[PDB]
C-alpha cells in the first residue's frame, strides 16, 4: 500500500512531469504495441496502429489522463478507478496481464523524458503507485 511518503512523492513528481502527459502517453502506447505485439490486437479497430499514428497519439492523451485521475484519487484508487476498471474488464475485455506491461512502458518513457526528476526514490513510489493502479483496474475482473 501507499504510505504518506509515497503519496507525497508521486504528487511531487506528477507536479513536475504532468505538463507532458500527452507526450508520455503517446510514447508509452507506441512502445507497448511495438515491444509487446500481443497488445496490438486491442487497438486494431483503429484505422492506423502503425508507428506515428494519430490514433495512438490521441489515445495517449486519454491514458495519461487516466494516470492523472489516479494521482488525484491516490487516497482511494479502487473507488477512483472503478469506472475505468469496468470499461477495461467488461466493455473492452483487455486481459489484465497487460496492465503491468503498460506500467513498465510508462516508467521507461518518464525515464527518457525526465532523467533528472526520475530518481530512484521517485521510481520506488511511482512503481508502488502503478502497482496500485493495476490492482484497482483489476477490480471488476473476477
Amino acid at each position: 500500500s501507499l504510505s504518506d511518503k509515497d503519496k507525497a512523492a508521486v504528487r511531487a513528481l506528477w507536479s513536475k512531469i504532468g505538463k507532458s502527459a500527452d507526450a508520455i502517453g503517446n510514447d508509452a502506447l507506441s512502445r507497448m504495441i511495438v515491444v509487446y505485439p500481443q497488445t496490438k490486437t486491442y487497438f486494431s479497430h483503429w484505422p492506423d496502429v502503425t508507428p506515428g499514428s494519430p490514433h495512438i497519439k490521441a489515445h495517449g492523451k486519454k491514458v495519461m489522463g487516466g494516470i492523472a485521475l489516479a494521482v488525484s484519487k491516490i487516497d482511494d484508487l479502487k473507488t477512483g478507478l472503478m469506472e475505468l476498471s469496468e470499461q477495461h474488464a467488461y466493455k473492452l475485455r483487455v486481459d489484465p496481464a497487460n496492465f503491468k506491461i503498460l506500467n513498465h512502458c510508462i516508467l521507461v518513457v518518464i525515464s527518457t523524458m525526465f532523467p533528472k526528476e526520475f530518481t530512484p526514490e521517485a521510481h520506488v513510489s511511482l512503481d508502488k503507485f502503478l502497482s496500485g493502479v493495476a490492482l484497482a483496474l483489476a477490480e471488476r475482473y473476477r
Partner: protein, 146 residues
C-alpha cells in the same frame, strides 16, 4: 531466439556506446532502492542506510560494473547465451542464494537507466532488442524451464 541482423546491430551499437562505469552503478543502486529486499545480498558492502548512501557506495558501484561486463559474454555470442551463463547461474543460486525473480528486477532497472541516458535515442525498436537480449540472459541465470 533467432536473432535478426538488425537486432544484432542494435545490441552491438548499444554496448559499444555504453559507459559501464556510469550505467552499472546506477542500475544496481536503482535496483537496491526500488526493490530493497535485494540489499540482503550486499550486507558486506558498507553503507546502505538510505538512498544517498547506496548511490554513493563504491562497493555497489563496483558490483554494478561487474554486472554489465557480465553481459559482454552474451553480446559476443548471442546464439549461445544459455550455455554461456550456466556457471554464473550456478554461482548465484547455489552459493549466493539469489532469488531467480531478482534477475528480472535488476534487468528492468538496467533498461530504465539506459533509457535515461539514451533519451529519445532509446526508441521502441531499441528497447525491444535490448529487453529481448536481457530476457534471454535472465532466463539463463534464473534457470528457467524451457
Amino acid at each position: 531466439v533467432e536473432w535478426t541482423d538488425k537486432e544484432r546491430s542494435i545490441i552491438s551499437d548499444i554496448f559499444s556506446h555504453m559507459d559501464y562505469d556510469d550505467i552499472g552503478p546506477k542500475a544496481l543502486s536503482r535496483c537496491l532502492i526500488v526493490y530493497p529486499w535485494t540489499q540482503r545480498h550486499f550486507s558486506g558492502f558498507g553503507n546502505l542506510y538510505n538512498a544517498e548512501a547506496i548511490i554513493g557506495n563504491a562497493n555497489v558501484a563496483a558490483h554494478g560494473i561487474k554486472v554489465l561486463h557480465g553481459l559482454d559474454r552474451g553480446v559476443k555470442n548471442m546464439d549461445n547465451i544459455a550455455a554461456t551463463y550456466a556457471d554464473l547461474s550456478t554461482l548465484h543460486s547455489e552459493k549466493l542464494h539469489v532469488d531467480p525473480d531478482n534477475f528480472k528486477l535488476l534487468s528492468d532497472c538496467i533498461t530504465i537507466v539506459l533509457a535515461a541516458k539514451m533519451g529519445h535515442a532509446f526508441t521502441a525498436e531499441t528497447q525491444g532488442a535490448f529487453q529481448k537480449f536481457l530476457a534471454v540472459v535472465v532466463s539463463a541465470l534464473g534457470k528457467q524451464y524451457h
